[PDB]
Design a protein around this ligand. Structure first.
Ligand SMILES: OC[C@H]1O[C@H](O[C@H]2[C@H](O)[C@@H](O)[C@@H](O[C@H]3[C@H](O)[C@@H](O)[C@@H](O)O[C@@H]3CO)O[C@@H]2CO)[C@H](O)[C@@H](O)[C@@H]1O
Ligand SMILES: OC[C@H]1O[C@H](O[C@H]2[C@H](O)[C@@H](O)[C@@H](O[C@H]3[C@H](O)[C@@H](O)[C@@H](O)O[C@@H]3CO)O[C@@H]2CO)[C@H](O)[C@@H](O)[C@@H]1O
Ligand SMILES: OC[C@H]1O[C@H](O[C@H]2[C@H](O)[C@@H](O)[C@@H](O[C@H]3[C@H](O)[C@@H](O)[C@@H](O)O[C@@H]3CO)O[C@@H]2CO)[C@H](O)[C@@H](O)[C@@H]1O
Ligand SMILES: [Ca+2]
Ligand SMILES: [Ca+2]
Ligand SMILES: [Ca+2]
Length: 642
């Protein structure tokens, strides 16, 4: 951990270390120009530091230059020759140990991320990149998220996409699949979703996907971070060419924006893929990651380590990393893996730094309550959401109430006939806010509640239903599935959909498919071709939400003012959104979630001449008390016209 004489007697573990070496510059890394390249490395506990230069990604050094000790724990060096096309690493001696690492501020790397690449990053911008414009977004509750893996999207043999498994595969328009159905980008833009959330597209570890063996089967979600500030090599057409993955990701984002879609990056700042080998511990051992009392890794992540976001240089790394994805790649939002492992101060400064640039940039995360050496009152989780204004959190209470518990596989939920889940559904209809009485969750405002019944984790909705409806036919399970999706899209808050949920995606019952083959993980376009009715259904639900601002209320005060739950029997939920809620064109809406297969009659509130808006196929009678008779599991939406 180092010669503790170099750092004023104070160890990397004492609390007086932090305020000592707080570098105030935003110039860490290397800045290339033809005249010179300047390097700055933060490594306060090292005795020596060298820049090592390479001509080829897997060559031997051509120069090995010593760096000068500089201010606030940093080392500098200027090289007064055109270093374009060169690769480099940092070699440091920490105590009596030498290690050679990639630059933590690497913005480009060679294959598998072991050497930093020097290049003019403005040569990676696609044509017109400076003219890139974002689709409008007035409120987070106006977003419809679609969670997608780059490999899943196109790797099925019948996807009809040329660059299968690649960033460029999501740039291709006009692709067709079995029976000529639209696939890929056209299928996604055809749905009406507004944001594509991509599973890890930063550079994840070689042990997960080896970028030199892409000619053999491979698959991994990528939750194993290696280089935080550069794209994953296996999604490029050429992982050996350091510029290719950058240019190709930018082409992807530019095209999505041009087609009306925004891009959310799944980011993992809570843990690295290997606390022993990552560059953080090579360069400053004992700083960037969290430690138990015995100076072993705190392991709240169940992955091996935790990043010490609360320490100032690590908070600065995370924030400069995010601002890099925003500024260099034009990213529109971030989903924070295990946000409950990150401290509140870091999350709020992130929200602030983004708001300074563009408040429509999204920040959502997993606010789970989880043990770690990070103090309980400092965790950015649902318990502390009052301290995290404007940050959305996955609403697991809503998820479990709708489809049934994710950990006990056979337990039913509201859609599958379970008893007593109506209040759980109502709590998420209200956007997870403090609505009143028993109707309360963690959110202060509905922008803090992300509604979902499916994501990449755990069984798919279809697979969950299959595990918990032993006496249900296939048609019955389809109706349950459809009802679950309708609840997400008609609840206050931020609706979130899993790619392929529109065609009842299955993983053959695999619960945790993170390294399962493409046969398990691909978007199955043959299944999608067999489920075009259900895709149309999902497309129409998304259109219904878009056509009604009353479903997207911006504040908890509006929800408390305009949302009212109505008389309804067990296994149903009924509510109204009254008096042009949020400027809705209709005067009132009435919404019915029916989980009963049979027929039933409801007395509608006396709000005016009701008219059908959605789900007419379930309506046996609508008569002006005013009466509605329906049959079958699903949603019915009525309106009192203006
Ligand atoms: O080899 C490292 C690591 O692999 C396995 O952990 C993986 C999980 O099993 C897998 O579900 C996935 O977990 C991530 C969630 O999907 C994601 O939503 C995110 O928020 O965080 C989770 C990771 O923290 O990926 C991990 C990492 O690959 C295995 O179970 C571990 O024991 C093993 O250390
Ligand atoms: O080995 C520990 C644990 O790992 C796995 O749990 C993961 C879940 O699959 C994943 O959904 C998420 O779980 C969170 C729930 O979604 C949320 O409702 C609430 O319960 O917090 C949970 C996290 O604490 O992340 C965990 C990560 O461990 C696996 O499925 C479990 O069986 C296993 O016990
Ligand atoms: O557009 C509003 C409309 O959306 C929903 O209707 C969809 C059906 O639920 C879905 O099964 C599908 O059904 C149609 C077939 O695609 C088509 O081949 C033909 O058979 O007509 C079917 C019935 O319309 O697509 C529709 C349209 O998206 C919702 O159920 C309706 O209540 C709603 O009015
Ligand atoms: Ca990689
Ligand atoms: Ca905000
Ligand atoms: Ca099955």
């Amino acid at each position: 951990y180092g010669d503790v004489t170099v750092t004023g007697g104070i160890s990397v573990f004492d609390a007086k270390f932090d305020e000592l070496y707080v570098y105030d510059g935003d110039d860490l890394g290397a800045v290339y120009a033809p005249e010179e390249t300047r390097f700055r490395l933060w490594a306060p506990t090292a005795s020596e530091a060298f820049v090592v230069l390479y001509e080829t990604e897997d060559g031997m050094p051509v120069k090995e230059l010593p760096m000068k000790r500089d201010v606030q724990g940093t080392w500098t060096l200027t090289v007064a020759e055109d270093c374009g096309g060169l690769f480099y690493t940092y070699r440091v001696k920490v105590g009596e140990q030498w290690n050679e690492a990639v630059d933590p501020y690497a913005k480009a790397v060679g294959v598998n991320g072991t050497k930093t690449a020097i290049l003019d990053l403005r040569s990676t911008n696609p044509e017109g990149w400076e003219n890139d414009q974002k689709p409008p977004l007035a409120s987070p509750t106006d977003a419809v998220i679609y969670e997608l893996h780059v490999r899943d999207l196109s790797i099925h043999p019948q996807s009809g996409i040329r660059e299968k498994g690649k960033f460029l595969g999501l740039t291709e328009e006009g692709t067709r699949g079995p029976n000529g159905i639209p696939t890929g980008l056209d299928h996604i833009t055809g749905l009406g979703v507004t944001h594509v959330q991509l599973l890890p597209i930063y550079d994840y570890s070689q042990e997960s996907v080896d970028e030199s063996r892409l000619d053999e089967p491979h698959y991994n979600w990528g939750y194993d971070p290696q280089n935080y500030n550069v794209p994953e090599g296996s999604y490029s057409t050429d992982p050996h060419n350091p510029a290719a993955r950058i240019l190709e990701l930018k082409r992807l984002i530019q095209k999505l924006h041009a087609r009306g879609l925004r891009v959310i990056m799944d980011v993992v700042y809570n843990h690295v893929y290997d606390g022993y080998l990552i560059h953080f511990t090579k360069l400053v051992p004992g700083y960037y990651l969290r430690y138990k009392a015995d100076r072993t890794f705190s392991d709240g992540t169940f992955c091996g380590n935790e990043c010490a976001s609360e320490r100032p240089i690590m908070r600065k790394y995370i924030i400069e990393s995010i601002l890099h994805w925003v500024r260099e790649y034009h990213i529109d939002g971030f989903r924070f893996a295990l946000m409950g492992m990150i401290d509140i101060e870091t999350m709020n400064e992130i929200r602030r730094r983004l708001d300074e640039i563009d408040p429509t940039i999204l920040t959502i995360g997993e606010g789970w309550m989880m043990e770690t050496v990070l103090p309980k009152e400092l965790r950015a989780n649902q318990d502390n959401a009052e301290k995290l204004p404007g940050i959305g959190m996955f609403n697991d209470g809503m998820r479990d109430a709708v489809k049934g518990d994710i950990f006990i596989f056979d337990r039913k939920g509201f859609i599958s006939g379970g008893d007593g889940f109506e209040d759980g559904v109502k709590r998420g209809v209200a956007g997870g806010i403090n609505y009143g009485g028993q109707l309360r969750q963690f959110a202060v405002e509905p922008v803090q509640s992300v509604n979902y019944v499916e994501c990449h984790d755990n069984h798919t909705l279809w697979d969950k239903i299959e595990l918990s409806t032993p006496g249900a036919s296939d048609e019955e399970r389809r109706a349950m599935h459809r009802l679950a999706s309708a609840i997400v899209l008609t609840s206050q808050g931020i609706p979130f959909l899993h790619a392929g949920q529109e065609f009842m995606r299955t993983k053959g019952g695999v619960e945790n498919s993170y390294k399962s083959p493409i046969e398990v993980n691909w978007l199955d376009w043959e299944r999608c071709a067999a489920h075009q009715d259900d895709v149309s259904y999902m497309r129409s639900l998304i259109a219904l939400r878009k056509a009604h601002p009353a479903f997207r209320l911006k504040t908890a005060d509006e929800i408390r003012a305009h949302l009212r739950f109505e008389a309804a029997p067990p296994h149903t939920v009924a509510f109204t959104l009254r008096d042009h809620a949020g400027g809705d064109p209709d005067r009132h809406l009435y919404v019915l979630y029916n989980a009963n297969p049979g027929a039933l009659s409801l007395e509608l509130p006396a709000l005016g001449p009701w008219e059908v808006r959605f789900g007419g196929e379930h309506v046996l009678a609508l008569e002006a008390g005013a009466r509605l008779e329906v049959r079958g599991v699903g949603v019915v939406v009525l309106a009192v016209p203006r």
